[PDB]
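User: Can you write out an input/output pair for a complex, sequences first and structure second?

Assistant: Here is one pair. Inputs:
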Amino acid sequence: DIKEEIFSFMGILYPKLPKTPAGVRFLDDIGNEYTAIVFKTEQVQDYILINTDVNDETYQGWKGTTALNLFPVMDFERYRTRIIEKGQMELINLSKAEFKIKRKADFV
Amino acid sequence: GVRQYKIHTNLDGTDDKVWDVTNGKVRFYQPSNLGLQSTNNIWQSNGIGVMGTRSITQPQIEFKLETFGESLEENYQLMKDFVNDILSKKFVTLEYQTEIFQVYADLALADVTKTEGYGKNGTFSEKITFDIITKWYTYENLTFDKIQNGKVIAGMSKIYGGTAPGNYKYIKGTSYTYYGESDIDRLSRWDIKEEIFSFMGILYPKLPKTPAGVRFLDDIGNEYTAIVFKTEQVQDYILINTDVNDETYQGWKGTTALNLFPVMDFERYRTRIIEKGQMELINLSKAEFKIKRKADFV
Amino acid sequence: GVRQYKIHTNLDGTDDKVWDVTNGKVR
Amino acid sequence: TIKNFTFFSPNSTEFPVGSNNDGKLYMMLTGMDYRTIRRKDWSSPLNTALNVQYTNTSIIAGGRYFELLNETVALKGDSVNYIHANIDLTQTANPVSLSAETANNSNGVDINNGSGVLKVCFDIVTTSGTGVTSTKPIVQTSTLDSISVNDMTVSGSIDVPVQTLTVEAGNGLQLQLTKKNNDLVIVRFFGSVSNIQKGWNMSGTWVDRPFRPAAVQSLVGHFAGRDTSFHIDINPNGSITWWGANIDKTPIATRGNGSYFIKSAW
Amino acid sequence: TIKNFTFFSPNSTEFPVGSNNDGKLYMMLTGMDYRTIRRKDWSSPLNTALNVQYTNTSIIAGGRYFELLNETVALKGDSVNYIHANIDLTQTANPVSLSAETANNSNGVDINNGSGVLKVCFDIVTTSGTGVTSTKPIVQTSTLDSISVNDMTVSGSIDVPVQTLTVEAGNGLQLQLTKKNNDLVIVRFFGSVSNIQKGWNMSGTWVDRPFRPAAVQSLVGHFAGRDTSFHIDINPNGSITWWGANIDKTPIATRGNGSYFIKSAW
Amino acid sequence: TIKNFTFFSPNSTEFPVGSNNDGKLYMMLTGMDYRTIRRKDWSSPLNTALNVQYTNTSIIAGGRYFELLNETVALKGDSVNYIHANIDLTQTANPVSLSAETANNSNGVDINNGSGVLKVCFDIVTTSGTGVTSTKPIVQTSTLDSISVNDMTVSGSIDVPVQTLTVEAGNGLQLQLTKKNNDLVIVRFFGSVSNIQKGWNMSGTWVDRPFRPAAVQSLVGHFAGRDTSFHIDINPNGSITWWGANIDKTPIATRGNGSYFIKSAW
Amino acid sequence: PVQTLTVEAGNGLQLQLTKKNNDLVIVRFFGSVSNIQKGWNMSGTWVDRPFRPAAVQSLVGHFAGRDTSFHIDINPNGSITWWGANIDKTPIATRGNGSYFIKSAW
Amino acid sequence: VQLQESGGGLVQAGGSLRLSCTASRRTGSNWCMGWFRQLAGKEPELVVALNFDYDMTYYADSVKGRFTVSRDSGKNTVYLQMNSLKPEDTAIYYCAARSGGFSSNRELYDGWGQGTQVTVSS
């Protein structure tokens, strides 16, 4: 439930069904999707690591102790923006997701 | 205890003249800045910084130049000799010593003032500025030797062989010997973990026609550059100096020196900017390096 | 009560070195 | 039967040295059991997402030496991961493997004398949902008998034996003695003294043999709420002699701490 | 990758033991780093003019074992000579050499994991212009984690942690507390006391938690230049109770040492 | 000459490692001499009539490792039997044997450098006329130089150095000082004091340098058979200052124990 | 050639040595001596190697304002031995010139 | 610069005993040969010394008129004739030799012996 400004986020995504794209989608205050980070891998991944930090941007799938760059396999058309608006994030074919959000305050 | 500055007209050279600019008749006081500047080419996207390439800038060093001659004649002589000693070389070397370090800086005179506003005995109080060429370095000597492991021999080598759970034996004069070492190749390699301004090397080729030199591998084990030569005859040794301002590639056979530039692989010598990773030998039995280590701040 | 500043070499990393720039030897 | 190992084999067959014999030898030299390790990170392990990469770590487990060279262990998220070295001698090609487990499952299995898989925990790696938050190594225990040393520096603490004794010395005086390392004694005075003269032996219990000093010890005490003091002598025979002034029928509260050594030089 | 050593090689080729692997193993068993040695003179070295002949000395440096058998090192006259063992693994036929140097030039070079020459000082030999005047060995350090021992004999000293605290107890009384091994405390009284009654809690600062005893401790003190004394109780809660006689407006200097244990039995 | 062992043999023949060289290496790693052992009963020995059966016991003697596997030693009845491991390197096929002896006949023979039979006692087995009544192992000694440790647990005792000094302080005052670990001092007062004033230095011998504290120490004493007390200051320079009341021509017996630390926080 | 050396011999005694031709040395005594006994080695700095004689040299000195004298021995090993009478806590000014040869017949 | 420490053992208080010491070589001029005393675990101290080149003796005030140091020909051998012995005199007597005269400092001595134990019975 997105109520505040953020810089970026980082997350560990656990896909559910095989042969099905997985990721997350973002919806605005009126419930319309405006951006999403979704992947379609050839092989099932144990988990996917994402990081929207402009200076340490990562989209990598982990299978055992092996990491794979999943960026070439992202739905580029759905990834409209990295700018997260108020509204909500839903999971896409995930059993669980663990986030570390970098909350923002221009002045303190 | 206190910090020491010295000006060398030729560091590690046979004709080196040293001016002790801490205790001598010509002294340096108050360096303008021994610090540095850095840029990461950051641009802000509504306060959010977007990082680019990181780069260091070394500022000029300006010192207060003071003479301690006991007469007008001595002070004029001191100024004239000090300045012309600097002016007579392509560059000069500042030695910066404390209880925790002894570092060097290759400098070029940027400006020097000369006025008439004398104190007792016509002593000078002027300003001297230096442009930085190579700021803060030390020399590190490293030897690389191409050593091969022995063979594993049942009955001789330390190994738990034979019937389960395996064994070795102590046998007078044959007992057990160690076959070799794990990663014996480490002794013929430079494990590059630090920044370098340049290096000097004495390379010992093995075989005649095959190229001979050194190769540099990055952190992911890929070759990005190599300094290699294909001579008609085996050279006793090859001298290489990678310094941008004074490079050399010279082979030695007997008392004969040969310029190796014509015989250097111009395709493989991609860069002199040495990255973290490792240096391997190419058809060399041994190599002796004098590395000019880099320290941006001290 | 008074404000505290610290320099972290790797916030949230096991190798983090913290310089107390309010009470340490470097301020 | 006697099986000899560290000896020459005159006919190159007599004394084969097995891996289990060297294992037991190494365990004995270092003073380790099957429930501890010897471990050294020659270079730091590296954490990446829910993984720990042992870059260059040597381990001795059950007297068996092995090296972890860029060996990655996958971790459970939001968990305390107990990293184990598992030794299965039946897996002849790869007898050692690493695991990340929910508890310390070290089993103390004697792999040098019998069958079974030795499991020994050597690292504790705590995770968040995204990566490693902290790492703590398992302690390396040295089990020794008698040590002769020149100098020692202790960064933590030394635990030494402690014995206590309460003595009803007589005349209302009570001593509470605490002895540490079987040498240093601190006596705490309690009770209230009456009907005693200077030089007189107190009418009660003598000090038990384990608390008796080699030489007479004079311990200073104080009368509560007064500016007056006393002393008692704990004699080598265990008797206690009063050395305060004469005390009449009215009891006076006796307090204070006094220390003594049981043992003299040699 | 896991590299195994103290294991069976089914086809006599799987796990050969390299000299650097044994080096690391031995360093771990004995608890030595690259800045110390293990050394034993089986027979006494012999001094002849400006020379030391090691008749039969074994050394372990960087986990590498070697023997000095009638090995003479030449010395500098009227000097303190630092005798070093130098290990250069590239010198395949003669990896070890001895040197006599003007300073302790031990370099801690990791010869089992990397390149370089290990230099480690093991002896200090002082000379006159004609011969050896004295010899002192370098200490052999054993770096251990947790030790379980039955008995120990120390010929030098044990260094344990020390903490200090100054308490302004109130009424002019000052306590300077020194705690060693987190257990034994010696209290030194200072200041001058006034305006206090027997049984009253002192008006100042309570003892900090790390110095509080498990049980009440009565500490005897003395009034400087007088034949009078007092005692105070350090209570487990940190409070201090006055147990001398009532003191008026005129301060009286308070001095003396009192000891107590923080920890009880078990 | 230098003989190298823990080094790679390029042609598999350069550095053969003998059993004597490994013996010395192992002795050095564990810190054992020829008068001790390393011993571990992997399974309990069994007592049957006047016999002890070592079921599975490993022993290290003179750095030589061997195993006792169902090895029976016949015992003398109604006796204290000293069980020895005897190593005779000339008995090529069977260099090790066990004996039950009437005394501890450990001989400390250097078998790794010279000739001779090493005898080392490792067990003490007491009998009745019919069987074993008790068994006590010989202590396994670790001879170390400098130890750096985090934590230590001692089940027996720590023996630290003890120094004593008697000071004829002046004016009839005597101090008997006992210093342990070179830090903790307990002062015992003796003698009888006369002709002294408050603040005056005692007219006799100053405290010897090894007993001088880093900071002034006030030590409380008591006058035998009286309600009165005194204190003295042991100054860092070694002088002693009287801080009791003024004493006239008539001597008063001085007694009591006072403790101080020589070393402060460092 | 001329070489000079100042030695703080200990006990308050100061020697100022002037060596000419690397052979002839003239020692000038300065300072004031206290707390020394006959036959005792002085508590300070030993003579630098270039000024050490091949054989022991006994150099006579005088006590300023007195009719009393002393002598010191400069030993080949560099040490200085006091050969005057025993001196108490009060220092007495020491002066005088003494000469010696560094080299013997060779 | 090797040392031999002949003589020394057990004797009664108020009695007499002797000590012998021979040095292999002499390090130079102002050749002093003597003995350092170590009582009840305290710091070692020079008690008896003889300047060979000057034939001058040193005795510590505590042993004056009780002890006598003698020389044997040109053998570089020193003897300590200890008469009217005391219980305090029970100490470990090490032989010290040097070039440069008498000194309180241990390091300044070119030759240091093993040490012979003196036990004055009561």
